Amino acid sequence: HTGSCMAVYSVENSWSGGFQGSVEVMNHGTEPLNGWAVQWQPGGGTTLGGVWNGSLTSGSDGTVTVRNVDHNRVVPPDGSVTFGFTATSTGNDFPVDSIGCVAP
């Protein structure tokens, strides 16, 4: 009954026309899950660009996500892992709110 991941989302830096962000995701879930993701609604006039230590995609539902953490293979299991991404903008150089993680 219940038992899902938890995440800590932070903004690294922002600049005119874009920003950088990072997320830590801990294995608070009862099971380790390959392909888990961190998704959010982008700010008005902002969109994702690239990622490192992970993969990223945009969705047609007007939301964007960072998925498929690979580097959990290098660290020991049942720990926490972090990764970063960058976004580009023509309006909101900031996100909407703080967000958590999801599982497939």
Domain regions of the chain by residue span: 1-104
**Closest Cα to residue 83, out of 3, 4, 7?**
7
| Inter-residue contact 46 to 11 (CB < 8 Å) | no
Distances in Å between the Cα of 31 and the Cα atoms of 38, 58, 71, 103 are 17, 26, 17, 10
Count, residues in the chain: 104
The β-bridge partners of 22 are 10, 84
Instruction: Compute the C-alpha angle 103/49/15, nearest 5°.
Output: 115
Q: How far apart (Å, rounded) are the C-alpha atoms in residues 32 and 20?
A: 27
Please state whether beta strands 55-58 and 64-67 pair in parallel, antiparallel, or not at all (unpaired). Answer: antiparallel
- In Å, how far from its chain's centre is CA 78? 19
Buried b / exposed e over 33-45, threshold 16 CB at 10 Å, is: beebbbbbebbee
Q: How many Å from the N-terminal Cα to the C-terminal Cα in the chain?
A: 17
